[PDB]
A paper describes a structure:
To understand the structure and function of the C. difficile eut bacterial microcompartment we have determined the crystal structures of two proteins with homology to BMC shell proteins, CD1908 and CD1918, and show that they are well conserved between species. We have also determined the atomic structure of CD1925, a member of the EutQ family of cupin barrels.
The crystal structure of a CD1925 variant, truncated at the N-terminus by 16 amino acids (CD1925(17–157)), was solved by molecular replacement and determined to 1 Å resolution. Two chains were present in the asymmetric unit, with residues 28–153 visible in chain A and 29–157 visible in chain B, with the majority of the C-terminal His6 tag also visible in the latter chain. The protein belongs to the EutQ family of cupins and has the distinct β-barrel fold associated with these proteins. The surface of CD1925 does not display the distinctive charge distribution patterns seen for the oligomeric BMC proteins CD1908 and CD1918; instead its surface has irregular patches of positive and negative electrostatic potential. A shallow, negatively charged cleft is visible on the surface of each protein chain within the cupin β-barrel, this cleft corresponds to the region that coordinates divalent cations and acts as the active site in the metal binding cupins, such as those with sugar isomerase activity. In the place of the histidine residues are aromatic (Trp94) and hydrophobic residues (Leu 96, Ile134) and in the fourth position a glutamic acid residue (Glu100), which is also present in the cupins with epimerase activity. The glutamic acid (Glu100) is within hydrogen bonding distance of an aspartic acid residue (Asp102), which may act to alter its pKa. Because of strong sequence conservation seen in this area for the EutQ family and the fact that this region is solvent accessible and it corresponds with the position of the catalytic site of other cupins, this region may act to bind ligands, or act as a catalytic centre (starred residues).
Residue numbers in the entry:
A (entry chain A): 28 to 153
B (entry chain B): 29 to 165
The structure:
Amino acid sequence: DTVDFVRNKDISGITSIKLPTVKVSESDRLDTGNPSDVVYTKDLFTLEESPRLGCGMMEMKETTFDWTLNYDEIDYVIDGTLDIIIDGRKVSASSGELIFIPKGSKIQFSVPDYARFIYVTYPADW
Amino acid sequence: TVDFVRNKDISGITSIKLPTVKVSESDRLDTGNPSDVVYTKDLFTLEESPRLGCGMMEMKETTFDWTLNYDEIDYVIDGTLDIIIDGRKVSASSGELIFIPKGSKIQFSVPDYARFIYVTYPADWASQNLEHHHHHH
Ligand SMILES: [Mg+2]
């Protein structure tokens, strides 16, 4: 396969992914503008594979950063704790919980310790 | 009011404690076969989430036919979900993911049991039909 994780990509495009085999690396580092931030985003589907829904793996360690979303997002927290700071308020999810974030939200992704989560977005392509 | 634990912020940003999401008979999908056991519980109204649909699905000892004229991502929490497409099988168990592109004619096949989150586009997946509604009038 041409990816570095384990999947079964069927002829039809239907795909299973063994998510524990998805490992982030430095090519997935997100530039927040602050080089000390440690944030990884690893898209799991090309646009050709999934033209409408985006889906990837995000990991953060001891980092809080500002970001504005151009898309709707569902985050399913696999491990750790993710805090979302919005307008001075906090919304949090730990392992096995989810967060929905509407398009246009001006947030901080805030991870005092560690978090690993799937993100599903719409649209995949701006 | 909903029957699960969530924090719905003023901004629309919402956390959900998914283990508190319990399916009930109000969520039972009538497949046509009375012995089938399928539950679908949407977790967001259209006003809450106008583009992404998201809910909890459970199945037990059931396989049924479905055509998805919408895209779907499933995260399998417990059990095993099989997707049968053109005589082939794609499977995900606890901790694994499935993507189903729009236009897929499948069987959802759960000979054992499965509990999974689904995320769809468009949001109102159950109205992606000629009737524009969840049930035929
Ligand atoms: Mg064929």
